[PDB]
Amino acid sequence: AQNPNCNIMIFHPTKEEFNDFDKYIAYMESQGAHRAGLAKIIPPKEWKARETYDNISEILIATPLQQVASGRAGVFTQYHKKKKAMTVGEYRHLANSKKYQTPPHQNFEDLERKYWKNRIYNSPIYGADISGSLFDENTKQWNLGHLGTIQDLLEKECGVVIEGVNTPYLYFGMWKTTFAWHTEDMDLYSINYLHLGEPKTWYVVPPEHGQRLERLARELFPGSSRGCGAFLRHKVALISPTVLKENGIPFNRITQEAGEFMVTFPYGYHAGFNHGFNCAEAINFATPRWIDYGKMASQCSCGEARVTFSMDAFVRILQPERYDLWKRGQ
Ligand SMILES: O=C(O)c1ccnc(-c2cc[nH]n2)c1
Ligand SMILES: [Fe+3]
């Protein structure tokens, strides 16, 4: 078996290897990449997402979210308080202000220590899930706005045409901006490109060990767990690497820098934080190997998890027994 320790693999495709997205995903899996839950892909030195990031300041963050924490430094939840709209230019200025700017640090490990020590005592503001793309329409390879859709993949594998669309999202981050422990909707894959700015540190649990994280979360967030049998779908819970290690949870970490792709694999739990002002683009995708994961994905019928119109059909086709209850919660 490839990659039995479930380490995060890093790939350096040639320009030739970079010409067929599905084929390279499959190659990575042939080398055991998926066992870690996360892989990094460094694009060929020849490649670029777009020419310049000069003229992005006028994009609108219609609903910036302030991420307010409750709990302890290593075990906390966060809720999203809506703020007034601002442009990316205004958001960048805010990110770099004294209140929000990255503090001095020696290296990534030092900044990580500061993050887990102090995150809960600040409330950074995030631009999240903004439909759009910063890829040049002329970029022909690994353009996240030109992938094949999940709906077409489900039709190709299962024989049934479904409604729905599948488009990328932009994320504008600042220091301490946080993404909670989660797997993707329907335990899909995701691909994330860091377009510009400061890094993003990721934590990931191997898919074969996802249930261990779920058990620990139920212990650490007991009220949340009683309210919803899949409360990690709410995407509000944070658990530090120190607490994970104390509880024997297998995990790995890696820092993504501008110009790098990260792929998240089905049922790979992940979380992380931004180092400073940055912009990332992400989208979910599917392969034939995903189908069996989508059939088994847990669902929140709490009401709390955010439903896209596109997910209805995945539950309807792949999980007909669960569909009624899930639909009520949406
Ligand atoms: O903020 C980010 O960079 C980030 C990282 C990993 N996952 C998501 C996500 C959003 C919805 N599903 N997954 C967003
Ligand atoms: Fe994600």
DSSP string, 221-259: SHHHHHH-TTGGGG--EEE-HHHHHHTT---EEEEE-TT
Is the separation of the CB atoms in 264 and 32 below 8 Å? Answer: no
**From the centroid of its chain, how far is CA 254?**
13
Q: Could you tell me which residues are beta bridge partners of residue 169?
A: 131, 282
- For residues 86 and 94, is the Cβ–Cβ distance under 8 A? yes
Do the Cβ atoms of 68 and 242 come closer than 8 Å? no
Which protein residue's CA is at the shortest distance from atom 7 of ligand 1?
Answer: 179
Phi, psi of 117 (to 5 degrees): -70, -40
Cβ(172) – ligand 1 distance below 6 Å = no
Ligand 1: residue of 80, 192, 285 to mutate (most ligand atoms within 8 A of CB) is: 192
Return the sign of the alpha-carbon dihedral for residues 272, 206, 184, 69. Answer: negative
CA distances from 7 to 4, 32, 36, 191, 205 (A): 8, 9, 5, 18, 10
Resolution in Å, one decimal place: 2.0
- Name the residue with the closest Cα to ligand 1, atom 8: 179
Secondary element (H or E) of residue 284: strand 278-285
Residue among 204, 214, 215, 145 nearest 179 (CA): 204
126 is in an annotated binding site: yes
Ligand 1 atom closest to 185 (CA): 12
Helix (H) / strand (E) containing 154: helix 150-158
Closest atom of ligand 1 to 190 CA is: 13
Sheet with strand 178-182: strands edge to edge: 178-182, 269-274, 200-205, 252-256
d(CA 146, CA 149) in angstroms, rounded, equals 9
Whether 269 is in the pocket of ligand 1, judged by its Cβ within 6 Å, is no
Tell me which of 150, 177, 179 to substitute to probe ligand 1's pocket, judged by most ligand atoms within 8 Å of the beta carbon: 179
Pairing verdict, β 200-205 and 252-256: antiparallel
Ligand 1 mean position, distance from CA 283 (Å): 9
Asked whether the beta carbons of 310 and 166 are under 8 A apart, the reply is yes
Please state the atom number of ligand 1 nearest to the C-alpha of residue 171.
1
Q: Which ligand is nearest to the CA of 199?
A: 1
Residue nearest to ligand 1 atom 14, measured at CA: 179
> Any idea what the Cα angle at residue 215 is, between residues 213 and 217, rounded to 5°?
70
The CA distance from 96 to 92, in Å, is 6
CB 102 within 8 A of CB 175: yes
What spatial distance separates the first Cα and last Cα of the chain, rounded to whole Å? 40
Contacts of 174 (CB under 8 A, 6+ apart): 91, 94, 95, 100, 124, 125, 126, 274, 276, 277, 278
Closest Cα to atom 10, ligand 1: which residue? 129
Domain ranges of the chain: 1-330
Determine whether the shortest distance from the Cβ of 190 to ligand 1 is under 6 A: yes
Q: Which of 324, 268, 317, 297 is nearest to 156 (CA)?
A: 317
The helix-helix angle for 150-158 and 311-318 (nearest 10°) equals 20
